[PDB]
A and B are shown apart, each in its own frame.
With several copies, the nearest count.
Chain A
Amino acid sequence: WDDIRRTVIVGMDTAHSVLEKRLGVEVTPETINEYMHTINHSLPGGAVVQ
C-alpha cells in the first residue's frame, strides 16, 4: 500500500516548453541529467536554495 500511495507521475513536457518559450532557456539531455541529479537530492528533503 505504501508504494502505491507514494507514487506520483508528472509529465515533464509542459515545463520544458515553458522553459523554452517563456524563459528562453534551452533544454538538452545534459540539462535533463543535471535536473535529475538535483531532484534526486531535493525530493527526499535536501536544500537547493535559501
Chain B
Amino acid sequence: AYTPQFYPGATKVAENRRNHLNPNYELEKLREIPDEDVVKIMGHRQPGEDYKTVHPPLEEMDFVEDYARDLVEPLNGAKEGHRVRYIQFADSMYFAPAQPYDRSRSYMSRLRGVDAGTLSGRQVVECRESDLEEFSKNILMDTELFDPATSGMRGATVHGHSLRLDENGMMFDALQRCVFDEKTGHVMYVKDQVGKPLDAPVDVGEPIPEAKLREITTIYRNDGVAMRADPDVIEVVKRIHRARTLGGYIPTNETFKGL
C-alpha cells in the first residue's frame, strides 16, 4: 500500500510534528491525573451526576434507511445522545510541547468525530462529553502534549500565548485559574477553564524542564531550531504556493509543466 510520511523536514521540530501527526506513535506518558480531577477542571459537570442529553439515544429515535450513513460506526457518546462539550488550551510560544495547528492536525488524524478549531491564542476541541472526557484525560492531559507551565486550559479570556513568562516559568493568565506552589514545586488548578472557582485545588504535577521542552516542542524559533535550518519545509511550502497559483491561473497539464 502507501506508507504515510506526514511532514517534510529533517530537523527536530519536523520530527516532533511527524510524531504528533502519526497515529501509530505512542505519546510519552508524563503525569497521572485522575478522571475526576480532569472532569472537575473542565467544569462542564460535577463528577457523580449522570451525563446530560441533547437528543434521545440513537436506538430510541428512528431514522430513514441511509446506506451511506449507517456503515460508519458512531461514537459511544453519540449513541447515548450525550451533549457536545469542549476542551480548550492556550499554548505558549516559548517552546510549548504542542502548538495550535499541530494540535489540530494531530487531533483530526488521531481522534474520531471531533471538531478542531485553531487560533493564535487558543485551540479548542468539541466532542461528545463522555468521549471528550475519555480522550482528554488519556491523551491531552497526562502525555507530552501538556505542560502545566507553558500550556493551560482556558475557556475564556485567553491571553498570554505570546507574552513573556513570569518569574516561575509560567504563562500569564488574567483569571489565574492555575497556580504554581513553591513548597512542593507542583502546579495546582484553583478554577475551572471558564473561571469558576473549585472547591479544592487539583494538582496537575511538576512543570516540564526547559531542556526537555527544547527537544519536544513543535515550534520553529531563532533561539530554538529555525526554519532556515530546515530548507525542505520551506521548499514544500513554496511548491504548494506555486501549484495553487498555477491551478488558479489555468488548470491544465501544460500550465503545470512550469511547476
Chain A: residues with CB nearer than 8 A to chain B? 21-22, 24, 49-50
Contacts of B52 in A (CB 8 A): 24
Chain B: residues with CB nearer than 8 A to chain A? 52, 54, 83, 156-157, 159
Question: What does DSSP make chain B's interface, helix, strand, loop or mixed?
Answer: loop
Question: What does DSSP make chain A's interface, helix, strand, loop or mixed?
Answer: loop
Residue pair A22, B54 in contact (C-beta under 8 Å)? yes
Residue pair B157, A50 in contact (C-beta under 8 Å)? yes
Contacts of A49 in B (CB 8 A): 156-157
Not counting A22-B54, A49-B157, A50-B159, a sample of 5 additional A-B residue pairs whose C-beta atoms are within 8 angstroms of each other reads A21-B54, A24-B52, A24-B83, A49-B156, A50-B157
CB nearest neighbor in A for B159: A50
Contacts of B83 in A (CB 8 A): 22, 24
CA distance A24 to B52 in the complex (A): 8
Least distance between A25 CB and chain B CB atoms (Å): 11
9 shortest A-B CB distances, which residue pairs?
A: A24-B52, A49-B157, A49-B156, A24-B83, A50-B157, A22-B54, A50-B159, A21-B54, A22-B83
9 pairs, CB–CB < 8 Å, chain A vs chain B:
A21-B54, A22-B54, A22-B83, A24-B52, A24-B83, A49-B156, A49-B157, A50-B157, A50-B159
CA distance A24 to B50 in the complex (A): 13
CA distance A2 to B157 in the complex (A): 35
Contacts of B159 in A (CB 8 A): 50
Least distance between A32 CB and chain B CB atoms (Å): 20
Contacts of B156 in A (CB 8 A): 49
CA distance A28 to B144 in the complex (A): 43
CB nearest neighbor in B for A24: B52
CA distance A24 to B159 in the complex (A): 27
Least distance between A17 CB and chain B CB atoms (Å): 13
CB nearest neighbor in A for B53: A24
CA distance A50 to B122 in the complex (A): 12
